[PDB]
Short mmCIF file of C-alpha atoms and ligand atoms in Angstrom, two decimals:
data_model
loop_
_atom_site.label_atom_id
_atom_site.label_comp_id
_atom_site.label_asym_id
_atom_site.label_seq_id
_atom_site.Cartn_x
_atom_site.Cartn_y
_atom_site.Cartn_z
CA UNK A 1 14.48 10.67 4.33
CA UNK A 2 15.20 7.40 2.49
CA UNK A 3 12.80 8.78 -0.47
CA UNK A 4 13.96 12.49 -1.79
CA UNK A 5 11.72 14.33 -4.40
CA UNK A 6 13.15 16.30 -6.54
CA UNK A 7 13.81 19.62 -7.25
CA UNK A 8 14.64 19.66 -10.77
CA UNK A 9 16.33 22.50 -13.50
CA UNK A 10 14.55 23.52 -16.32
CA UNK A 11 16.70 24.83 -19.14
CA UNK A 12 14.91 27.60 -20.94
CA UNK A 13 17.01 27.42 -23.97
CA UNK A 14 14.95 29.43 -27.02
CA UNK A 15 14.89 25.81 -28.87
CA UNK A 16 12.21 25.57 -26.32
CA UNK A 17 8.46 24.62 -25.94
CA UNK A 18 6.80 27.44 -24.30
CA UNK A 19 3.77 25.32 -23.45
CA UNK A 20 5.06 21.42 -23.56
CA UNK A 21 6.09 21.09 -19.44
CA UNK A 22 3.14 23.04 -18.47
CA UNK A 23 0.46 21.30 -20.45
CA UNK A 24 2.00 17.96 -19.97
CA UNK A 25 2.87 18.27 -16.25
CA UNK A 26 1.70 21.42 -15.08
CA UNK A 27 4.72 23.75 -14.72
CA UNK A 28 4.83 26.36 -13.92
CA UNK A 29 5.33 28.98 -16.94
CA UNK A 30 3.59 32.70 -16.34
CA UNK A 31 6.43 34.14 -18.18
CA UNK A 32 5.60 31.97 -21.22
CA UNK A 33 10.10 31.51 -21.22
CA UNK A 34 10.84 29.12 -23.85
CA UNK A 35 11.54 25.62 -21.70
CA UNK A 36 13.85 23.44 -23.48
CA UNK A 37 15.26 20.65 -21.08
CA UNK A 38 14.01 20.03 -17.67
CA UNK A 39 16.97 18.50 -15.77
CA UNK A 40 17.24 15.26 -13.08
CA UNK A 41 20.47 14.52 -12.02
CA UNK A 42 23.93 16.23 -10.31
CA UNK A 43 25.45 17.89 -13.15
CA UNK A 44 28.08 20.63 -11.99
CA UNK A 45 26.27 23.13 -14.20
CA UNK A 46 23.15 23.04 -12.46
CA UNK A 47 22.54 19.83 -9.63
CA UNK A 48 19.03 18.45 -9.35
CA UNK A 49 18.33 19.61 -5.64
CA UNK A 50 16.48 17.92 -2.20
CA UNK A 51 15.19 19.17 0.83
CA UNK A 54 14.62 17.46 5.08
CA UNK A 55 15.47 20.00 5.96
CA UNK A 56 16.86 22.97 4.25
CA UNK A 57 17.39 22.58 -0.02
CA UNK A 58 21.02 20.99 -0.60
CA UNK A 59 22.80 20.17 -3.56
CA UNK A 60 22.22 16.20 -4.99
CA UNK A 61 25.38 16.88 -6.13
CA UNK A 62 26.85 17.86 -2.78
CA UNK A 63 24.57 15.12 -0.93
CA UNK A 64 26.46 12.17 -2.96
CA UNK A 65 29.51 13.95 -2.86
CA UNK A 66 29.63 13.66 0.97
CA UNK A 67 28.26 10.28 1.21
CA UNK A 68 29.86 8.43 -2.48
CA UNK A 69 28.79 4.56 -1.25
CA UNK A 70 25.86 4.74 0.55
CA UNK A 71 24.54 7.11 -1.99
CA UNK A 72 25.87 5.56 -5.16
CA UNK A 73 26.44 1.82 -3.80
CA UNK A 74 29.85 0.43 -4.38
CA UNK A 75 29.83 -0.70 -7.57
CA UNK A 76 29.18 3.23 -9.59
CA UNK A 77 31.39 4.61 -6.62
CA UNK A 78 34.08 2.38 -7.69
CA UNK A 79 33.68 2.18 -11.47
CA UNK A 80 32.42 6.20 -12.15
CA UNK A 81 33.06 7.74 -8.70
CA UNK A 82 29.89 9.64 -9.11
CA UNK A 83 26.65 10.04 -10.96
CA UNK A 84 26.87 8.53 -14.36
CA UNK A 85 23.96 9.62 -16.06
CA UNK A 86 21.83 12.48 -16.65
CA UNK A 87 18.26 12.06 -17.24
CA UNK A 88 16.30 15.04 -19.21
CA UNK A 89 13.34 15.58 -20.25
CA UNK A 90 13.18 17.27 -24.04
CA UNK A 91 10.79 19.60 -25.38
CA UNK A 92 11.83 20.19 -28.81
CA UNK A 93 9.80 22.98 -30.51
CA UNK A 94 12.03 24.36 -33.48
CA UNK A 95 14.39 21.65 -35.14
CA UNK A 96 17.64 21.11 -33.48
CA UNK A 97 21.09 20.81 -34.71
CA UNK A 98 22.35 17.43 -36.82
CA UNK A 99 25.19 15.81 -34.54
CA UNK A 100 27.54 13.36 -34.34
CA UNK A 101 29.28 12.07 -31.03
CA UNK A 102 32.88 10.83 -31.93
CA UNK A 103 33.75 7.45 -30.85
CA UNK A 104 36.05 6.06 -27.92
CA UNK A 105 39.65 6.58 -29.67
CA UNK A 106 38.85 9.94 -31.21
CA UNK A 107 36.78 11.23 -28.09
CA UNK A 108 40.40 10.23 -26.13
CA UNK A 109 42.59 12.66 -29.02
CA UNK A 110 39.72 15.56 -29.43
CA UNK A 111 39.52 16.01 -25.43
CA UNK A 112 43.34 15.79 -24.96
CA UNK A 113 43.76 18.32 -28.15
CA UNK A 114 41.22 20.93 -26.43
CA UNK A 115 42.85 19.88 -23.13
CA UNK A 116 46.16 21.09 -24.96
CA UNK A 117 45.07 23.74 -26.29
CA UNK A 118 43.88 25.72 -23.45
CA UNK A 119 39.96 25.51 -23.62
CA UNK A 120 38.05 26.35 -20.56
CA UNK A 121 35.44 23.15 -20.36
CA UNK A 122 32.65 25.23 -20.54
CA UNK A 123 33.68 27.30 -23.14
CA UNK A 124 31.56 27.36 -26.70
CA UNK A 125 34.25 26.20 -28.73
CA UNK A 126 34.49 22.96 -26.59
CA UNK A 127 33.26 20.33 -28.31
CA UNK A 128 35.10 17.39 -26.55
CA UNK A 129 34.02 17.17 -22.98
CA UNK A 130 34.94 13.56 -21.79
CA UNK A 131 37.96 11.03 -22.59
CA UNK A 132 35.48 8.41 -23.68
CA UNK A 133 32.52 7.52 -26.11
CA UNK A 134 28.79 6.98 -24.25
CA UNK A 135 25.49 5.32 -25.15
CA UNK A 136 22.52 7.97 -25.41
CA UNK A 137 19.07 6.76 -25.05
CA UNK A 138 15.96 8.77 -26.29
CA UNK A 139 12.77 7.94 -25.39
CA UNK A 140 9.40 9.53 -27.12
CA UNK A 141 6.89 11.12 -24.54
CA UNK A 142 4.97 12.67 -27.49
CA UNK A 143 5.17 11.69 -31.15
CA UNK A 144 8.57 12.22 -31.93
CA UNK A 145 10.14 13.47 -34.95
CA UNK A 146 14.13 12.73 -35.60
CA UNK A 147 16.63 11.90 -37.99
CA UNK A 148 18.75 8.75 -37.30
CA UNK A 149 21.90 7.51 -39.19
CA UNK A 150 22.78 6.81 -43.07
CA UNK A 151 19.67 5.45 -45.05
CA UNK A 152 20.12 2.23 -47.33
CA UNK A 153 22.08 3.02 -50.25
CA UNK A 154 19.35 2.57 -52.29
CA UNK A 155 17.05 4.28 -50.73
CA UNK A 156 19.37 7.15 -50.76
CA UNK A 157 19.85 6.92 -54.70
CA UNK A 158 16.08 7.20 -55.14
CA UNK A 159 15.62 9.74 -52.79
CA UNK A 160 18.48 12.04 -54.36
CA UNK A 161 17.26 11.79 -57.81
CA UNK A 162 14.76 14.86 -58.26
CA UNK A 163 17.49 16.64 -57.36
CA UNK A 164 20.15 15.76 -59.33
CA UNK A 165 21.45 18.24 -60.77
CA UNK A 166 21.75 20.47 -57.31
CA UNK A 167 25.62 19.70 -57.26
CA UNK A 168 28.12 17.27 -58.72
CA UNK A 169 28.54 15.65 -55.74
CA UNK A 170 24.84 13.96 -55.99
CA UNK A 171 25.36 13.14 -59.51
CA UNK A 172 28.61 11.75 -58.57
CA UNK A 173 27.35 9.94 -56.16
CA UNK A 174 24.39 8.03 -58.07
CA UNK A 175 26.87 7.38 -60.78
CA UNK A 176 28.39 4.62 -57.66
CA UNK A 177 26.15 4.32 -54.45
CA UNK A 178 28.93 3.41 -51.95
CA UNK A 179 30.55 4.32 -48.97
CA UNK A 180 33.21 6.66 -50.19
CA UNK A 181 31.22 8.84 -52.42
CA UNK A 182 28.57 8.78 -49.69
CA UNK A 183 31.23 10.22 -47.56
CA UNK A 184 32.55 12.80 -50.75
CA UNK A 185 28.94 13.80 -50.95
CA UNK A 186 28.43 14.65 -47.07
CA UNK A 187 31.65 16.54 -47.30
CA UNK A 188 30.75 18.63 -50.59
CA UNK A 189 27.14 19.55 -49.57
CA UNK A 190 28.84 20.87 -45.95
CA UNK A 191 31.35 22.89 -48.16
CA UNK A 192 29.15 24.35 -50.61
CA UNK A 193 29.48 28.21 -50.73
CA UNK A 194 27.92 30.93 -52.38
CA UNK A 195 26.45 31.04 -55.55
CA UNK A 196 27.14 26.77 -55.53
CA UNK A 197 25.11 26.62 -52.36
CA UNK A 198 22.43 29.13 -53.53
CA UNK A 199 22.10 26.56 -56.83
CA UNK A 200 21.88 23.67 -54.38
CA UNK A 201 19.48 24.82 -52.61
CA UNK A 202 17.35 25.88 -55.67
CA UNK A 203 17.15 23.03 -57.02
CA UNK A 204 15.88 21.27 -53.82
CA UNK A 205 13.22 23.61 -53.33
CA UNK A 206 11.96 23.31 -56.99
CA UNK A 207 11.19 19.54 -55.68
CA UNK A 208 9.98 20.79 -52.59
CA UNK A 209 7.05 21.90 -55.16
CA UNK A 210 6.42 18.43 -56.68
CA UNK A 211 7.19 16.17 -54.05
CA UNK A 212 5.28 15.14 -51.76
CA UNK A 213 5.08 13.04 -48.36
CA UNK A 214 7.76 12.06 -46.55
CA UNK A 215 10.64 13.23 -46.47
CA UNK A 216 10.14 15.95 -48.21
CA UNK A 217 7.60 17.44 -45.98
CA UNK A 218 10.29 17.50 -43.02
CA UNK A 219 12.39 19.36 -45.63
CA UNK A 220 9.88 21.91 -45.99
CA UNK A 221 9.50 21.96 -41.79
CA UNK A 222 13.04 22.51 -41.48
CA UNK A 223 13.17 24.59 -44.21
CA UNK A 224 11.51 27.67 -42.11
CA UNK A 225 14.31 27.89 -39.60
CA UNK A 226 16.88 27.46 -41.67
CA UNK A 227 16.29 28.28 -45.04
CA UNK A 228 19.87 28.92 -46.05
CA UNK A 229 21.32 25.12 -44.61
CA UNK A 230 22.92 22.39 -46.40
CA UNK A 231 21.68 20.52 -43.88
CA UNK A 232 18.30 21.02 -45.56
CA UNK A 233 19.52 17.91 -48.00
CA UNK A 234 20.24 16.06 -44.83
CA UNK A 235 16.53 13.66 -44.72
CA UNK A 236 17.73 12.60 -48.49
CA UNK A 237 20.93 10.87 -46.60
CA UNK A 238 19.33 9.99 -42.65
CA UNK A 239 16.53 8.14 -41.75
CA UNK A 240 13.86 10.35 -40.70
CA UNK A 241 11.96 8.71 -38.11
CA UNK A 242 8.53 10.01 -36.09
CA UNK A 243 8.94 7.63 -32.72
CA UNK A 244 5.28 7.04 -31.66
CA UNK A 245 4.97 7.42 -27.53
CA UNK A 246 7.02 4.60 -25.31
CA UNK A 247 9.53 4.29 -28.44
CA UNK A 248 13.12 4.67 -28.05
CA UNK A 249 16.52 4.71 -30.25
CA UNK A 250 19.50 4.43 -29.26
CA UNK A 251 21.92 6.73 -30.33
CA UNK A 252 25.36 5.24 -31.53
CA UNK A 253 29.19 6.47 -32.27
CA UNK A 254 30.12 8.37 -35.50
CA UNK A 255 26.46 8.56 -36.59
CA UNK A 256 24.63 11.81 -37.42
CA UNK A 257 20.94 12.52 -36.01
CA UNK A 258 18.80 15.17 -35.23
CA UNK A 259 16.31 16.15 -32.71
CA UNK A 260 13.18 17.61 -34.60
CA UNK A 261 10.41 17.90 -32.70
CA UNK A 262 8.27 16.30 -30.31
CA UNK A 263 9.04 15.33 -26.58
CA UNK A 264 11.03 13.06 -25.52
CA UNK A 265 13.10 11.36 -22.27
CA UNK A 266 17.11 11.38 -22.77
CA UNK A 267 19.37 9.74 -20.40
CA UNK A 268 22.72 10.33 -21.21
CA UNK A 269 26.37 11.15 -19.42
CA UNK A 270 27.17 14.33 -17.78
CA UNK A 271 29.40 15.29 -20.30
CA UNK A 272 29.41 14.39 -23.68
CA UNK A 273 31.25 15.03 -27.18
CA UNK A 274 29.37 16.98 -30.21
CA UNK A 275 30.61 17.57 -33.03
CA UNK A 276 28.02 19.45 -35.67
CA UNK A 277 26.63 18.41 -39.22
CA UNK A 278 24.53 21.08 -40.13
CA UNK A 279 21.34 23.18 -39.50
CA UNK A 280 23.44 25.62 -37.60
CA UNK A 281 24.73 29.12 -38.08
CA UNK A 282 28.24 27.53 -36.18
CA UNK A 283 30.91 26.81 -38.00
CA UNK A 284 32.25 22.92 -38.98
CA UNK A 285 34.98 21.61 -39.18
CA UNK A 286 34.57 19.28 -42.13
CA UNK A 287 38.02 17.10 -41.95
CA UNK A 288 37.15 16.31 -38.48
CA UNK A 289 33.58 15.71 -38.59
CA UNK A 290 33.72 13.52 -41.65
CA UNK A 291 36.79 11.52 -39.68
CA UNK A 292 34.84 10.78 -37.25
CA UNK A 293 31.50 9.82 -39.38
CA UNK A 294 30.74 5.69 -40.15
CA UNK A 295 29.52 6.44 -43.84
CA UNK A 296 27.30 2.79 -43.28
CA UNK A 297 23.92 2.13 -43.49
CA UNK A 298 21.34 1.66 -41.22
CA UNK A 299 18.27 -0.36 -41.85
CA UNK A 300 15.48 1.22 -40.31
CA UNK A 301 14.49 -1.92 -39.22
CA UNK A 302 17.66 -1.38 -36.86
CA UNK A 303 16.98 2.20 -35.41
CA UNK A 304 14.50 1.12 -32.45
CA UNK A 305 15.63 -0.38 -29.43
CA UNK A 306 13.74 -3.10 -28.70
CA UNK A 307 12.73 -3.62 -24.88
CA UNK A 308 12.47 -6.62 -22.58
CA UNK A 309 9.33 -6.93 -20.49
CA UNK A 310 9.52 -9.06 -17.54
CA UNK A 311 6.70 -8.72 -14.82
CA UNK A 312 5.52 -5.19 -14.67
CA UNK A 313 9.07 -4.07 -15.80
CA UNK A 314 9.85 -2.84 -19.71
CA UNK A 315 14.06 -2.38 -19.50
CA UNK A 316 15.51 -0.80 -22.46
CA UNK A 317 18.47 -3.08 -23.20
CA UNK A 318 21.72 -0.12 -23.23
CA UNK A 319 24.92 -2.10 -24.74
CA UNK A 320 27.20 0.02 -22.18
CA UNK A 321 27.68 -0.12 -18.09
CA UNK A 322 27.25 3.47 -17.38
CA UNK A 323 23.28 3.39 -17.20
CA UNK A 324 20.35 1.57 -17.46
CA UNK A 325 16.74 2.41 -18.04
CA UNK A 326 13.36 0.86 -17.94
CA UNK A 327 9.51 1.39 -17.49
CA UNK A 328 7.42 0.76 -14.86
CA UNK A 329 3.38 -0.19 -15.01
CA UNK A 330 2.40 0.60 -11.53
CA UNK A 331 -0.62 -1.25 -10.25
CA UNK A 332 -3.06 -0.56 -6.81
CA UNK A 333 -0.72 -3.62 -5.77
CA UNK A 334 2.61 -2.62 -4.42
CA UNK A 335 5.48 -3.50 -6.46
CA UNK A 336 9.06 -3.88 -5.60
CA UNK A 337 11.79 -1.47 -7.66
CA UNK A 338 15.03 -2.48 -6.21
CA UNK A 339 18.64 -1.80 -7.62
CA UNK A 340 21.82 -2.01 -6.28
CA UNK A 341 22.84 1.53 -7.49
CA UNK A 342 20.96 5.19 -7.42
CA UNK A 343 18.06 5.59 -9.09
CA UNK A 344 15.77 8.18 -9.91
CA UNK A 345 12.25 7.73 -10.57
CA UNK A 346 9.73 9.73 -12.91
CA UNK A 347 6.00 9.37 -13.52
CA UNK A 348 5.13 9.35 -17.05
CA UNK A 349 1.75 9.21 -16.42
CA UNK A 350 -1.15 8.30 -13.87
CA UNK A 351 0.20 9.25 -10.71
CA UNK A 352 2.78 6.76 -8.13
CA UNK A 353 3.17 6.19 -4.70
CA UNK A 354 6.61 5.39 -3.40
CA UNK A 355 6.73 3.75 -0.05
CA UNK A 356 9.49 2.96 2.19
CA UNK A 357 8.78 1.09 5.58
CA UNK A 358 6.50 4.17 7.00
CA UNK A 359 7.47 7.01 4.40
CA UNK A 360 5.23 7.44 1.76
CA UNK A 361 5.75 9.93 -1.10
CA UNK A 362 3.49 10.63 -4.28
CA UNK A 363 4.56 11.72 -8.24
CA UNK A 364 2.54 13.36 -10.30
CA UNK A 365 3.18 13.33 -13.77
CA UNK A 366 6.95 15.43 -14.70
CA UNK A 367 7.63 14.39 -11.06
CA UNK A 368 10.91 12.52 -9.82
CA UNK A 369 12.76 11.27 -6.73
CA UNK A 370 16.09 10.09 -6.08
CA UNK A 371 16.57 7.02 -4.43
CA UNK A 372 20.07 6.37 -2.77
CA UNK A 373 21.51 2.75 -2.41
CA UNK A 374 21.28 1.96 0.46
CA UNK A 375 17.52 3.18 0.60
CA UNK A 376 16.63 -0.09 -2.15
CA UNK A 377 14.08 -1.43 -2.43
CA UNK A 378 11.07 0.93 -2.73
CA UNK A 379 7.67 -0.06 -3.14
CA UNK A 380 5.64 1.12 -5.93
CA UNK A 381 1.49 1.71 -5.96
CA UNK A 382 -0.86 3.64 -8.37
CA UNK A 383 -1.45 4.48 -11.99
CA UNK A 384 0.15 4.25 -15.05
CA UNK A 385 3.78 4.35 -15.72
CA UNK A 386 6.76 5.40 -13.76
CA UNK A 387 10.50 5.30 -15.54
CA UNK A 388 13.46 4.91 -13.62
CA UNK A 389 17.27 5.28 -14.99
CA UNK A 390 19.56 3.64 -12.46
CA UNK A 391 23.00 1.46 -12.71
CA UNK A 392 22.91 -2.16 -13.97
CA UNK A 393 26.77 -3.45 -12.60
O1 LIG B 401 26.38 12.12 -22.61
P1 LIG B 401 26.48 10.95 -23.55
O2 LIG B 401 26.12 9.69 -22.83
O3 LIG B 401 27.93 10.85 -24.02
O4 LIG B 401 25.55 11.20 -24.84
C1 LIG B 401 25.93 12.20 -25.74
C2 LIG B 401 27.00 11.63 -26.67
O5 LIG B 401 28.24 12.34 -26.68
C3 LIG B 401 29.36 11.47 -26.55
O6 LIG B 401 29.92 11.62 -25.23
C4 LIG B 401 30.48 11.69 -27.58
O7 LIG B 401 31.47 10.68 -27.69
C5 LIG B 401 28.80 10.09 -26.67
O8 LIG B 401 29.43 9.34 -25.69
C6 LIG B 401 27.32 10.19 -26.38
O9 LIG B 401 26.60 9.38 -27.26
ZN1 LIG B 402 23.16 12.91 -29.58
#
């Protein structure tokens, strides 16, 4: 069929919403399993699948048909799928990260490459050669934390608590780069009784501050009580996206998923390297090599989208995907691209037709639409998102 819907993976990681996909979309859930990351793409690890026919692989379907399915210009430039579009359903706070950028992705792959590491190992951190774009986009409000704060709004956020460690009064002695970077470092290192102290201090404030960010200290605070990453909202933006908001999320810049949901289109494999609020282990030297110790304005930290005709894109500075939003009207539009896509309805409910095949979304519903199956036209209610390939 020229039109394929979906058969998507949920991930029921314990990070999980138990309710989030079912409420919003009506998933299935009579377990009540925890359902983290609902899955649209060919990932090796778990291929979205079609039907028509038995279920196949998308995955295997591409792989047997690169150009038609792809178009020339991904099959040629990636040689496959380039982008893996989730949907997140963050219901504890997730882990602060960093994703190394293009040089040090190439030396941390090749060193793990060296070294023996089975790609799908725990310990592997670097996953591909190369540094790529992520894109989140809020479904419900959003909380997140996203890149250095200005200086000075760092200075006056770090004052209440500063005598927690050295490092902070070192730092407010000269707000700059370097002792920005010192401080990140020490509050990762702390041990013991030092940490203990820290993190004594910081809840005594927790008691007579109020508002923002404190309060998503205190959040964060009840699943992991014993972090240094609990000081972490002092140093990042903390940001609450409102629905139809999106960040990008840049090289060798922590951030932190903290609750809400949200779209993410991303690569298949990516590069992580942790920053806290995580029982794992860090490697400091490395993560704070591969951290930009710059601020970000928060006037910065949206993307800002382009609206042209019933179509919202969402600008991405890099070749490997694209993304935009979709009003759909009782009119037929056109949604053409000269690459896969897949579709989604946010909301309402769409129609996809092609010459006599019609299919319908429903909210949390998707379809894959091969190259050579462009255009499609698009009927109904509300909002449908596509991720696709720009080149
Ligand atoms: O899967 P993506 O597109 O890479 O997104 C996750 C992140 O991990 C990285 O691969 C690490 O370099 C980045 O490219 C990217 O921002
Ligand atoms: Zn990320």
């Amino acid at each position: 069929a020229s039109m394929q819907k979906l058969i998507n993976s949920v991930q029921n990681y314990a990070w999980g919403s138990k309710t989030a996909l079912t409420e919003l979309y009506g998933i299935a859930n009579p377990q009540q399993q925890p359902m983290a990351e609902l899955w649209m793409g060919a990932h090796p690890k778990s291929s979205s699948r079609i039907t028509n026919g038995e279920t196949v692989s998308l995955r295997d379907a591409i792989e047997k048909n690169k150009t038609a399915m792809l178009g020339e210009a991904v099959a040629n430039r990636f040689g496959e799928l380039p982008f893996l579009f989730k949907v997140l359903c963050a219901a504890q706070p997730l882990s602060i990260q960093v994703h190394p950028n293009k040089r040090n992705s190439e030396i941390g792959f090749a060193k793990e490459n060296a070294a023996g590491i089975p790609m799908d190992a725990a310990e592997r951190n670097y996953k591909d050669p190369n540094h790529k774009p992520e894109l989140v986009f809020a479904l419900t409000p959003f909380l997140a934390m996203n890149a250095f704060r200005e200086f000075s709004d760092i200075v006056s956020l770090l004052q209440p608590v500063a005598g927690a460690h050295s490092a902070i009064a070192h730092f407010l002695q000269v707000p700059n780069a370097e002792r920005l970077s010192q401080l990140f470092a020490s509050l990762l290192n702390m041990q013991g009784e030092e940490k203990s102290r820290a993190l004594a201090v910081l809840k005594a404030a927790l008691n007579s501050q109020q508002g923002e960010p404190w309060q998503t200290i205190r959040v964060i605070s009840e699943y992991y009580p014993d972090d240094s990453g609990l000081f972490s909202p002092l140093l990042l933006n903390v940001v609450k996206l409102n629905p139809g908001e999106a960040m990008f999320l840049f090289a060798e810049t922590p951030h932190a998923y903290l609750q809400g949901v949200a779209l993410e289109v991303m690569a298949n494999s990516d590069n992580v390297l942790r920053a806290g609020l995580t029982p794992k282990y860090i490697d400091i030297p490395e993560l704070v090599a591969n951290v930009k110790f710059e601020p970000k304005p928060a006037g910065e930290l949206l993307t800002a989208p382009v609206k042209s005709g019933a179509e919202l894109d969402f600008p991405i500075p890099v070749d490997d995907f694209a993304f935009s939003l979709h009003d759909l009207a009782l009119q037929e539009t056109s949604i053409g691209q000269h690459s896969a896509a897949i579709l989604f309805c946010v909301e309402g409910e769409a129609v996809l037709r092609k010459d006599e095949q019609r299919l319908v979304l429903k909210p949390g519903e998707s379809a894959f639409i091969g190259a050579d199956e462009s255009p499609v036209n698009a009927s109904g209610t509300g909002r449908l998102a596509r991720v696709y390939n720009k080149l």
